[PDB]
Design a protein around this ligand. Structure first.
Ligand SMILES: O=c1ccn([C@H]2C[C@H](O)[C@@H](CO)O2)c(=O)[nH]1
Ligand SMILES: O=c1ccn([C@H]2C[C@H](O)[C@@H](CO)O2)c(=O)[nH]1
Ligand SMILES: O=c1ccn([C@H]2C[C@H](O)[C@@H](CO)O2)c(=O)[nH]1
Ligand SMILES: [Mg+2]
Ligand SMILES: [Mg+2]
Ligand SMILES: [Mg+2]
Lengths: 142, 142, 142
């Protein structure tokens, strides 16, 4: 399959697939500094058109916190198939847990593509008619 | 495919598929106020029965931190297929990074369905017999 | 299909599929103690070879915050198919929002497998030529 990728400019480091990475690393489009307990959108310098029927998902790398002291505020970013315009540049919403500096080109998160959920009919019901599972730790801890 | 949806009551705003959203927005079932550095379960006012063989995933919207100053503590909630009883109402576990107010009907997260992983046999081995990949930033940062 | 599992030693509690769990619970391989706003890797005490062409995803349980006071810094861990060496042991990267103790064998997170994304060709383009969707809350909140 093919992904069309448009880089923000010629100074962006090209992304690529590596042998031992099932997801593709994305890169900070510019230097970004963030103070402890502050938030910043980190631009990633790419816009894409994904294959027909696909969305993308973005998560941190396991070393992102170690190297950069940030967490991703939306947990996993969902890039909608429709986010494919010439100005629809991807971003990584970062919250800094310590003072930090991210440099241009640094690999701070990773993405993959996945088929979107199929079309679903939402059928309103008065009663579901199933037994309750419970949740929030119903199965205990041990 | 079909999802059966049972709303908590008649005051819940109905959820909807929108053209440019690959996931479907869910809504606070009531006003919720949360103090900085505190946790609150935000009820979403919906119980669902998903198509056979499917689970659901729930994440924040990208704008949830911006609009509401919260993160989702479990990162991506997994709605088990068995969570389909009449009292199995979905929730969003929120941790506030600043003082916040969420109003009834506010779209604070989003969901999609996905096929559950297949049945797997767990086969205990003494040795895997593969080369080590390493992890936690083994590929570096540049 | 099959997952080969190798435990850190013969005192790790073996992991198991339960009926009402679509994802499989994984356990702390030793007692771990964490202080508030500090970070620690929790070793999960397993190394796996997954079926051919599959990756794994690890996320917290909904009750992990309630039960243990931690968020997962990478949101959802991605376990690369190639992370299947004899020393490639899974971990859960915990950040403590409160002081906390986790005990050997506690179910702190959960995992499932998934098919890796297909091979994709990254095609460099100058213009995508689609209408802009916009993002970061372009659809509002009400
Ligand atoms: O982490 C994220 C989340 C969203 N988006 C964009 C694409 C998506 O379609 C839009 C709405 O969330 O914002 C990103 O670039 N990064
Ligand atoms: O974010 C979450 C995570 C889980 N659940 C429910 C459904 C799931 O089957 C049960 C146990 O995780 O709790 C939620 O409502 N929201
Ligand atoms: O939460 C995580 C994330 C990653 N890894 C391992 C598997 C992966 O292939 C490697 C590099 O991300 O680190 C884990 O054990 N747990
Ligand atoms: Mg990596
Ligand atoms: Mg949206
Ligand atoms: Mg569970």
């Amino acid at each position: 399959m093919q992904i069309k990728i448009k880089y923000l400019d010629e100074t962006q480091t090209r992304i690529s697939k590596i042998e031992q990475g099932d997801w593709i690393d994305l890169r900070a489009a510019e230097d970004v500094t963030i103070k402890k307990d502050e938030f910043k959108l980190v631009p990633l310098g790419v816009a894409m058109e994904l294959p027909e029927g696909y969305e993308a998902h973005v998560v941190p790398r396991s070393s992102t916190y170690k190297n950069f002291g940030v967490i991703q505020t939306n947990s996993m970013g969902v890039i909608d198939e429709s986010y494919k315009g010439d100005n629809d540049f991807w971003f990584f919403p970062a919250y800094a847990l310590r003072d930090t500096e991210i440099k241009k080109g640094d690999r701070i998160c990773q993405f993959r593509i996945m088929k979107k959920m199929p079309a679903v009919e939402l059928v309103e019901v008065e009663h579901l008619g199933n037994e309750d599972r419970g949740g929030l730790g119903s199965t205990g801890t041990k």
